[PDB]
Subunit: 392 residues, 4 copies
């Protein structure tokens, strides 16, 4: 059936494979069989992944202490700490996830029955499209990163170095992927597993935004179903019972949104802060020159993908607010004689109450917030180009 759990679990399982949101029974179609247990195989795999990412973080910290902590090299520590924070926040989210899934299944039951109808693109297809787009873009970004790494390595070896170095996979690992073998003894297995850990770190960084997108789409699906139900009575006379049902379903959707926001406030805050910091860093670094054209294509692809992913997360989150507001226009056109207390309550609720995901209530994810964030980014970049100027 068209349920959020059945539409989200195919990618929740892949995140479990990348050790995110440790749970048992996440592959089962029954939403009541998923539970969080500290003694589980997914718990052990995510514990191993956390240990590996922490080893990466300590190696980066040691390297930066040896070299010197600046505003440029600190981005590695920020990225690794953000991955660790994502791991911890996802552990807590998986702890809270049984109740979240249960309430999501309970409140979404009436939305699978008439007069609500499935749109041209059901929740499964929407989540699949969003997740496939995000996964493909992240895989392409990592592919261009690796390709640029190998190519910069080869052009750094074949000329501009007077040779004196046999091109090998070992030297690749010890040079491009240094600062980790200084603490650990070298081994091809060790190097390949470090590669897998870095890939999983990038995948977790992308999956934070992917999970936010999927949750926002799941909420906007039901909100759009409610909006379509309201629209389907545009030129027809509506009884008080229909308005009572619409108001009750809207109230239940608001309750579910509040519960999901309380559960995901930490994840939303972490994702927003991380995305803002990395967008500012990349916009600061946009003006420098790169040694090879492949580096230019990779860097511009990465910057465009990061900006687009942040904007798409914000727009998908604001889709909830826009969908809740869209019913107001149709409700404002209700005929005079078919106007009752229920319609007044519903209109007051949509007009006055803000209905959107929030970063621990500090801000509400809306299109207004996206425009304000864009302006703040512009101002921060204008200020930081003063710092950037003496370098060039």
């Amino acid at each position: 059936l068209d349920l959020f759990h059945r539409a989200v679990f195919p990618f929740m399982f892949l995140a479990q494979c990348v050790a995110i949101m440790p749970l048992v029974g996440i592959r089962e179609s029954n939403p009541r069989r998923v539970r969080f247990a500290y003694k589980s195989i997914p718990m052990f795999v995510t514990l191993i992944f956390m240990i590996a990412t922490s080893i990466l973080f300590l190696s980066m910290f040691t390297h930066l202490l040896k070299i010197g902590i600046t505003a440029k090299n600190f981005v590695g520590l920020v990225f690794f700490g953000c991955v660790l924070s994502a791991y911890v926040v996802f552990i807590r989210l998986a702890k809270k996830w049984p109740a979240v899934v249960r309430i999501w299944t309970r409140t979404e039951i009436p939305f699978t029955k008439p007069p609500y109808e499935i749109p041209k693109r059901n929740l499964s297809r929407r989540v699949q499209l969003a997740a496939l787009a995000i996964i493909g873009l992240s895989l392409g970004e990592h592919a261009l990163y690796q390709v640029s790494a190998i190519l910069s390595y080869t052009r750094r070896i074949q000329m501009c170095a007077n040779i004196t170095t046999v091109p090998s996979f070992n030297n690749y690992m010890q040079t491009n992927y240094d600062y980790v073998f200084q603490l650990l003894p070298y081994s091809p297995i060790i190097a390949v597993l470090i590669l897998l850990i870095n890939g999983a770190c990038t995948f977790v960084w992308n999956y934070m935004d992917l999970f936010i997108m999927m949750i926002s789409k799941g909420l906007s699906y039901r909100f759009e179903q409610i909006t379509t139900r309201i629209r389907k009575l545009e030129h027809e006379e509506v009884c008080e019972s229909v308005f009572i049902q619409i108001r009750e379903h809207y109230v239940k959707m608001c309750e579910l949104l509040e519960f999901v926001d309380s559960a995901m406030s930490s994840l939303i805050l972490l994702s927003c802060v991380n995305n803002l910091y990395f967008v500012c860093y990349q916009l600061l670094n946009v003006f420098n020159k790169l040694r090879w054209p492949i580096n230019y294509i990779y860097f511009w692809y990465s910057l465009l993908y990061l900006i687009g992913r942040t904007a798409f997360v914000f727009l998908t989150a604001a889709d909830i607010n826009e969908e809740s507001k869209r019913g107001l226009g149709v409700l404002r056109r209700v005929s005079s004689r078919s106007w009752c207390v229920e319609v007044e309550r519903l209109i007051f609720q949509m007009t006055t109450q803000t209905v959107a995901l929030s970063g621990k209530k500090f801000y509400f994810l809306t299109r207004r917030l996206l425009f304000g964030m864009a302006g703040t980014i512009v101002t921060y970049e204008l200020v930081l180009l003063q710092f950037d100027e003496p370098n060039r």
Copy 2:
């Protein structure tokens, strides 16, 4: 009759002559005969104009690559890309324009009948005044640009160059209007058509704002008619039927505004971003010195015209919001016994719902927004004068 189509089509036809909003039957007084067809003479003329503007853009890009992309010379690429984006956005707007015109004619029918009355300046005269002012100011700006070009050319030739150059139209085209003849062979016909293309580019840049102004005036006309209808019952006892009619007409006007905003969101966003960028650029360039007094007059006229055009676009767009709010003051004075549910609904709708054009819902074009934009411009200029300081 006093219709928006009959008041806007004289300038829509001129934009068609400058290859903007490609449509057929735009000169006919019947709003139902205008349609968008990809195989049409206006489509061919706008395709030629797009090809010419793209040739201009590629020539500018090649010249800037040869010289070097900085923050100063990039304004040419921004202008040409904005012209291209205006062409594309106007193509999509003309695609959506049949439905927009149809709904505009349908909802505005009751506003040509009593108790609504034509003001001292009908929609035709208002649109004519706005369009004539904009066209005359743009023609004057281009006239002073050309006059400053010829004069700077002559004073650059007659002294400060030791002659060694015969004053000719060919050298004018190859020197002031360079960077295009490097890719294309020289020809007087080629030079004159490039001149016409540049003039059309400037006219399109101005006509984006002109079209926004005309649409805003068309909406504010009906909103002011509604406001006057509300005012005409200040000290008279009003039945529920009159309030029902006023609320229904206000709701229909809000529907039309929402439809027009959905159609014109791309145009509004492009115009706002372009105007903000060019205003910031000109305010950054205001402090430098110019070689001749005619250059000073031309530059100050251009800066004043750009600032005034942006402010006038924003004020004309905010006129919709102000006109919708103006009826609240009269409605708040409704007598106690003649207060019903319809008046309460109408007051709640005007007070709570924001009624204005939006840039894809990211911001609402209001006087508050104009003041905020002025403050943002002041802050951006204060930051960018740090960059400007080392030059002088």
Copy 3:
């Protein structure tokens, strides 16, 4: 009687003596005898004062052109242009002032009758206190300016100049009050009248804010009377007629506020822009050193007086909003059985409608606006100290 005209005309007459708001019959106690006529003795005196101030402005412009227009010496042109703009705006305000006074007298009639009561400080005493404080502070500022001028002159003559200059009033006028005698022939009468013109310019600069303060106090007086009337029924059962009367009086006060705001939008905008510019200029200049202690005391007194006058104008204007909001708290405590449609309308009106003076609707003069302006001033000063740093 306690009327705004009878409480404001003693200072309106003094402004007439300083050639501000040209009117006839402004000294008469009848509000219907004041009218604006272009052929009048006050019109002639204000025309002479405008000619003199324009002569001052042209002399300053010529001096700055001879020396060089910078960001430091431009403050004189800004001050003189602000005085000229104040003259023109006050001419238009006096043109509109007959209707403003008539409507003010008409709507304020019920406020001089029960159940409204005169507070411990009537409107006459409040306006007198505000005007006397402003006039005394401005006279003290001018007195310290003149004292610092004479003292800096004497210490510049008696030492640090090797004498070679006989101390005289003529040399004072030609040195401290230069840039005006370069265009006009010297004469003791000419010098003394230029002194009087400068004093009148300073008095007009202060009287703009003084007039805004007086208007704000006049409106807040009636709003506080309404608030006290609402408060006087805290623990008593209120009939619908009393609430009808309160709502009607509040609506009439809102109408009067809207009319006064429409009349005084230009004055409010000019005063706010001028005060912001001068506050920013003085906060930029606060860090430099002064040659003598008397100069330090004068400059700090001037800066403190300017900041306090701007803050007091903003607070007096926001007193209208605070007074309108203060009745909401008492109305929210109305007993359940004595709650009717009138109370609901009144509460909705005060809660939703903003009730304050506006700068042509671009912003509303509230305490929130004062805090935002303080933050904007802090940001602007932080940015401009970058410009100020290389000087020291």
Copy 4:
């Protein structure tokens, strides 16, 4: 019983011992026996403490005049002036405190009776936890400050000075605690009392925020009791009398909040300004280097404690707003047939009226305000790092 006075007086007495909020009978359990009398032993002790702090302030001012007032050394004058302002504001607060305590006891009486119930952590335990955490953190900060002082003294004496100085308590007082013995003759009693005065100054600086936290917790306690009472009727049919009682209690709580805000506006403004200034100063100073690791730990502990204390004050104040808003979600789920005028009034009151502490109405202490303050701090730091850059 669970009363605010009985839960706050144990720490009010300690503040009295540190000479804050001078009152008599503050240790008595009866809220009506506390009164402010200018002729009292606590008045004499706080007068002595004010004289001592003023002596400290004058000594700091003399030292800075001898050395030179910069943006770095001025922090001592800011701290001492903030302590003096805290003393004066707390004197006025103790003057107003009889009425505040009386109204707090009067309005909180119904909250100690059914259907209101004591939560798992009563007001006494909440206030005790908050005050103990603040006192322990401040004592730890002072302990690390003193430890860093002694250690920096010893390492400055034992090496890097070529000895030539016998390590003694007298030299400690004359070197680390200089600028005060230049005006006063040296004495071990004088030095130890100056130490006690500095400790009391730090304790007053922390107790301003502590008192704000305690007041915010006291208000949020009753607001959370009201929210729980509203929640306890989620799936039960509610009569009009229960809603009348809930609305009346909410109105009384709003009245108490308004009274407390009027009494504590000066304290809130002073605390917010002081915290903002010191947070900006510390974030500006975060990038410099420190001579010893103990200095690093002390400075980072102080910065983290200051940031956390400011954030916790703001969050505790915003807890009132969040608690008032939390009842809206439950009230929005009231069944259709059990919806009456009282519920509509209550929902309108919570939705439209902002319910939070304010800094003299210039701003409202909410989570939105905390996020805005964080953004403002980020912007100010970005601007001020321009000033900080030439030092390093």
